[PDB]
């Protein structure tokens, strides 16, 4: 397996619940880069209006597909490493 050119270019296969979330906002494929997963997660949060309207780094997701995948009722976008580890639990790394 070749090392990805950057972390953003890591190729991944979302597990079934994350895949369901991605398809709900229009994703069509089974394999994605990490960058693509992050863009689709952002789009999910905006289209479902999950962010606090006044303090927009706070996301509320209790019992949403997203809260079920992350295991939390809310989180801060500023917690970069916590968000990455929550995402990583929901996918498998693949070749290329």
């Amino acid at each position: 397996s070749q090392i990805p050119a950057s972390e953003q270019e890591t190729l991944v296969r979302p597990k079934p619940l994350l895949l369901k979330l991605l398809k709900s906002v229009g994703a069509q494929k089974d394999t994605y880069t990490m960058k693509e997963v992050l863009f689709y997660l952002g789009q999910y949060i905006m289209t479902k209006r999950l962010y606090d309207a006044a303090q927009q780094h706070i996301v509320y997701c209790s019992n949403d597909l997203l809260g079920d995948l992350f295991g939390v009722p809310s989180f801060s976008v500023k917690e970069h490493r916590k968000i990455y580890t929550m995402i990583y639990r929901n996918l498998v790394v693949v070749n290329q």
Partner: peptide, 11 residues
Amino acid sequence: TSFXEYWXLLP
């Protein structure tokens, strides 16, 4: 700051 600008700092 917009949620879109906060999230853009992840990737």
